[PDB]
Symmetry: C4
């Protein structure tokens, strides 16, 4: 049968409470971004022109996470954005590249970047793998490759030198892939499939897209991810790369338009709190402890 | 797999009628709150600062149920509220306590409380059990423990001296636990799993949160619960705490979760808002009780014990 | 657990087309209302304060169906309503009674009523069964008994003398039993359950409530029912009880303890024509020349929420 | 729990295509497909046989882009012939024509006009009248015959045996369709294509997925699951090449769109179609390129260089609403 089964998304499930000995404040949110880079919190700001530039990356790094500077600009600009983050405190920083963009990656590495995010709409392709091999042979850096949803995809990327795999075809807030192409796999299932491969190799999984609430972070992690990438939640915050605008009562941020969210610190604080509480309910002091102990129930939309 | 099954809530379910010889009026609503405390009607008012204080507890007790005084006040104030209910006839009351609140527990027991509700967002925890053991070893008192959703939780609480188990993580109009933490089990499935353990030991199940209509009470009880704890339905009534406010045409009263920003003044796990004034709570409780009697008429059950014996339900689509 | 399965409503299913030799215009719609009262179309108007009196029962009867006069009136008044129909061309007519209403039934049978409809919210009662038995012992008439949703309930009523079984607890457009009592069985599942008993004894099933479109009639009949009782579909019509009024260039009349207002639906014939037409089309798709063929040939697919 | 329940029916919105390893860019994808046993197309798109989507201008544009148009039968015989001939005058272009039950005179004239496919169109294709018409045509005329509409294995098997060169699937879908409401009849489209393809692929008879296409993604879903081509009406209604009149209401330009079994369409049985205005979609060529791009993107995700590759490699997941 062509039907491989029932795909489950964030809103379809709820995590089941376990016996607990840990207070939410006692929980350790420390995780691995790649096999050689680690973070204090499992949050990553998306590589979109509407979410992560130098300001956003500085904020994320100071709060224990990491920003990925988007590639939608010239090489010199992206290297500059990376330098600005490194200048103010010597923080953790990442940057995205497309296919065949070897020189871009090279200059980003020399700028001091900690991770290169090899992004594409369909990560399980020839050209993505060729770029991966080419990067690994020409420069010394940890590479995150995406996006994928299947077992074979995850296996082939790890074998070709991937230091982390990014999961997500479909869930993005500004979606078109599900409608234009009719292609995708729901996030919970997508993480589950990819985790069964990656954890045998000890390779971290980044859950990318579809996060609406702090609860979704807990589900994505509990299901097998090591970190979570967020876009829309951070889009519209003061630190996002836009300018403020006024329409009636409400303040907006143009580039494209989304509602102003205020300081990012308040937004990140709530996400962290929600995750701490989640891991409290499930009696897990660490994310690795969460993987071993977590379970969920299917829920009707209602 | 991590998928343990499909969870069902109140709205996903409909009770199947049985052969009936009992009119709604003939129905006995007698039930057990704890191992040693009994109720005339299986209704409890939630331990919340917008639902239950002394007026609510008197109203509940006179109608055959029980009010449980919230813990969002000082010990001296909570004792006084218990003493004010005991001031008018032989009325039964409960009182809520948090983790490691042994002094509050001692004072309420000595204030002549009938039950103590050891209340937690996550009832299956080390802190709860140790607080349970303390009170059970040192005080003569029935203790309801919550909140839980698993069979492992209920068994462990019962073995450590729980006289009643309160079930509910996720349901409740003001609850946002499942949004902010992604945690919960739908209420019917929750009761079902917990009831399978609790009935073996003869320990009553309190179904807490998620009741929107009188038909939900019947569903909770039919599936294995002994009583139902309600908050939102009694929130707007005259007997609930907080003053009344008229905005426009209709009068409003404030309803607030305990894990809400206002109530805490920990990540917020409850919403806050105004709800319409609902008149006297006895008019409200009458409707709920009537619906339960009607429900048990359909299933042909003269008692809740009988209800448990001949209950069945169907799943429904959206 | 206590989960007896998944309950399907009209909106949950679609009928699968079969090989067809019959055009919609050629199919027969003749059915049995009771054990020994038959209709030319499988439509019945609800016994409600707001849908069926003498005018409605006449219109229904002249179209091949039948009207059940509601009980919410004097025995004298209800007998008179039956009288106005019978003398309007020997038309078939039914009348509703409640529990213990033996005398009302007696006078209605004398008035020459064709069917008595023993109405209860819960037909599987001691009081319903003894009312049925007391009617049969004292008078000679076909009795439809309802409402029920289970196979055990259907059997007991048939054993006690029920000539028709009315099915429907929960699905009625104006019903709140699902909300007040939390009780019910979705209409398709309910008809399926009761048919597995009643078809063996040759006792017709009346599908009652939930019919919102003509396509629902087909589903109800296809799944085992002999006829459908329809309420809100016929509520705003000219022939229904109530007066016309204008509220902002729109004509209205009431539908039901107050229970909201409905728009004027015009002449009842046009409404019935569409319903009958839709059912003919359905039976074309399923290649069924008769309702008996429909039962033998029917299959349906479950449909997702979207 | 049955007993007349045969399973859960899946529609376009119920499933998602699972990506595979890809070596193919969207630009390098072959969209060439089989229309009937003997006729083939360069893009797998057909314009519906409706009096509000396809006449000569629509058919010309469709063929000019690698697809085909089916001239609707809601006109007299000589009018339909003239439409077929008007397509023939603007280059050696392929064109189809719709036909109703027992309309043999119509079929002979349409074949004379140089029609490439006869579409024996019916609401219920699995009937005794349709099979009789199929047998009469295939014995009396040299022409490829697409027969619809059907949803079952038995239906498609019987039509193939009686000389159907193509099977058209779809009872239930269609933006303007109310068969589900009026009759309570239908099968969700994914399930319908699956059931019919399982038979038709054994005989190499192309399946036409008819109705229910709202987005370019649906085309991929229909093809991936077993269809050879996709018939569309809704998304072509209101284009510059559609036979309707252009009309300004407020700030937006509108054109009319109606089902063939609607009240207005039957004027010039009970209605099984709704009618309404649709926003002017502009040039048709532009609308098709978006569909083709999304289709290419889809096959790029599944790493399929041709539709034959797509059938062999495609798989999907069920999703909740
Ligand atoms: O305690 C809380 C939140 N919370 C609540 C509730 N939240 C849900 C239901 S009642 N009521 C409160 C009153 C005062 C301050 C916080 C409060 N969350 C939490 C506790 C342990 C664990 Br493990 C995980 C999470
Ligand atoms: O023929 C019709 C209605 N109808 C339709 C369609 N309705 C649905 C899909 S195409 N297109 C028409 C064009 C002209 C006049 C009526 C038309 N229904 C029907 C026919 C046989 C059988 Br068995 C069952 C039902
Ligand atoms: O336009 C798009 N097309 C496809 N994927 C996108 C697009 N925009 C954002 N995404 C993905 O969605 C993620 C952000 O998801 P969000 O947090 O739901 O907004 C990004 O990291 C991208 O991987
Ligand atoms: O703020 C909170 N967050 C989550 N649950 C709460 C909160 N406050 C009260 N509850 C629970 O929700 C129940 C009330 O539910 P309701 O009657 O359906 O509105 C109470 O009995 C509490 O157990
Ligand atoms: O007040 C009510 N409660 C429950 N059922 C009702 C009530 N009123 C009418 N009904 C039933 O519902 C049917 C009408 O449903 P409708 O066709 O969906 O409008 C009638 O035939 C009655 O048997
Ligand atoms: O009036 C009708 N009732 C039901 N289906 C129709 C009617 N008219 C056209 N159709 C079908 O609907 C298809 C168009 O589907 P659409 O592109 O989704 O709007 C056509 O190819 C016809 O097969």
């Amino acid at each position: 049968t062509k039907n491989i089964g029932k795909g489950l998304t964030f809103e379809d499930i709820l995590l089941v409470p376990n016996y607990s000995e840990v207070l939410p404040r006692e929980v350790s949110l420390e995780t691995k971004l790649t096999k050689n880079v680690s973070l204090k919190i499992p949050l990553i700001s998306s590589a979109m022109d509407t979410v992560t530039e130098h300001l956003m990356a500085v904020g994320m790094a100071r709060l224990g996470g990491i920003g990925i500077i988007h590639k939608n600009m010239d090489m010199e600009s992206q290297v500059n954005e990376v330098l600005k983050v490194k200048n103010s405190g010597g923080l953790r920083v990442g940057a995205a590249i497309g296919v065949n963009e070897i020189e871009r990656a090279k200059l980003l590495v020399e700028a001091g970047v900690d991770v290169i995010v090899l992004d594409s709409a369909h990560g399980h392709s020839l050209n993505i793998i060729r770029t991966l091999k080419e990067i690994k042979s020409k420069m010394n850096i940890d590479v995150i490759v995406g996006n994928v949803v299947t077992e074979e995809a995850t296996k082939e990327l790890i074998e070709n030198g991937a230091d982390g795999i990014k999961v997500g075809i479909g869930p993005g807030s500004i979606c078109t892939t599900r409608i234009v192409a009719g292609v995708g796999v729901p996030q919970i299932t997508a993480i589950e499939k990819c985790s069964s491969v990656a954890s045998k190799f000890g390779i971290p999984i980044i859950a990318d897209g579809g996060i609406r609430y702090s609860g979704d972070i807990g589900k994505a992690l509990a299901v097998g991810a090591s970190s979570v990438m967020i876009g829309s939640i951070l889009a519209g915050t003061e630190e996002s790369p836009g300018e403020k605008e006024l329409i009636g009562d409400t303040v907006y941020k143009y580039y494209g338009r989304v509602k102003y969210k205020g300081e990012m610190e308040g937004v990140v604080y709530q996400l962290v709190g929600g995750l701490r509480s989640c891991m409290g309910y499930l009696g897990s002091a660490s994310i690795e402890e969460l993987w071993k102990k977590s379970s969920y129930v299917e829920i009707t939309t209602s």
